């Protein structure tokens, strides 16, 4: 297969069987028999020729994997060598998280088109996830600014955590 089916789900297709009632012929049915003979088959011949060439000299490319490194929380102040690797790792994860929100958004848009006029109901699992990730993405990376960095991300989290532990502490005193 081309893409992993789990990452991009698709419910099974149900094509209703044709059931003609009129005596006239269906023009599309004959066109489908003329398109699949003068377009589909000739194109398949060229591809099969091209596909055979590729199999003769197969060669591979690998998906680079990055070894984990200490995060910004484990780096001494004004320690560039330790802060450099931690900062670079943070930037890579920021890029990955950007694409995750793109995967979820892509799934959400697909549901709206696939489900047609009933999209407002059948698209409930996707929309819940989309709101789930977007809330998480907003907290991790938002209002940081153009000169964003791991330090500002750490500071923002510590601002949220303090305002949460204080809220939790004083809730019991209500």
Partner 1 sequence: MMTGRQGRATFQFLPDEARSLPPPKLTDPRLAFVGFLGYCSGLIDNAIRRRPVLLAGLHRQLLYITSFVFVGYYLLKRQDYMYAVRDHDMFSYIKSHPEDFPEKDKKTYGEVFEEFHPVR
In the set 24, 50, 146, 171, which binds partner 1 (CB under 8 A)? 146
Distances (CA, A) of 12 to 9, 15, 71, 114: 10, 10, 43, 12
- Pick between residue 111 and residue 150 the one whose CB is nearest to partner 1: 150
Please count the other Cβ atoms lying within 10 Å of the Cβ belonging to residue 104. Answer: 19
Tokens matching residue 166: 């204080």
Segment contacting partner 1 (CB under 8 A): 29-37, 93-101, 102-110, 140-148?
140-148
Does 155 participate in binding partner 1 (rule CB under 8 A)?
Answer: yes
Can you give 93-147 as a three-state secondary structure string?
Answer: HHHHHHHHHHHHHHHHHHHHHHCHHHHHHHCCHHHHHHHHHHHHHHHHCCCCCCC
- Pick between residue 6 and residue 74 the one whose CB is nearest to partner 1: 74
Q: Which of residues 78-117 bind partner 1 (CB under 8 A)?
A: 79
Segment contacting partner 1 (CB under 8 A): 24-32, 36-44, 107-115, 145-153?
145-153
Segment contacting partner 1 (CB under 8 A): 16-24, 32-40, 102-110, 155-163?
155-163
Binding mask 62-81 for partner 1 (x = CB under 8 A): ----------xxxxxx-x--
- Pick between residue 109 and residue 158 the one whose CB is nearest to partner 1: 158
Q: Which of residues 12-71 bind partner 1 (CB under 8 A)?
A: none
Quote the distance between the C-alpha of residue 75 and its chain's center. Answer: 32
Distance CA 93, CA 91 (A): 5
Q: How far is the CB of 65 from partner 1 (least distance, A)?
A: 26
Report yes or no: 94 and 141 within 8 Å, Cβ to Cβ.
yes
Which DSSP letter does residue 149 get? -
Residue with tokens 């047609």: 116
Contact residues toward partner 1 (CB under 8 A) are 72-77, 79, 143-146, 151-152, 154-156, 158-159
């Amino acid at each position: 297969d081309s893409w992993d089916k789990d990452v991009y789900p698709e419910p099974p297709r149900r094509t209703p069987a044709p059931s003609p009632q009129t005596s006239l012929p269906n023009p599309i049915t004959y066109l489908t028999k003329a398109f699949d003979l003068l377009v589909d088959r000739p194109v398949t011949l060229v591809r099969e020729f091209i596909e055979r060439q590729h199999a003769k000299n197969k060669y591979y490319y690998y998906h680079r994997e990055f070894r984990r490194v200490p995060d910004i929380t484990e780096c001494q102040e004004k320690d560039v060598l330790c802060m450099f690797e931690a900062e670079m790792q943070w930037r890579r994860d920021y890029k990955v998280d950007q694409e995750i929100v793109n995967i979820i958004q892509e799934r959400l848009k697909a549901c709206q088109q696939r489900e047609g006029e009933s999209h407002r109901q059948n698209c409930a699992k996707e929309l819940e996830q989309f709101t789930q990730v977007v809330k998480a993405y907003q907290d991790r990376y938002h209002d940081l600014g153009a000169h964003y960095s791991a330090r500002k991300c750490l500071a923002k989290q510590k601002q949220r955590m303090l305002a949460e532990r204080k809220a939790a502490k004083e809730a019991a005193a209500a």
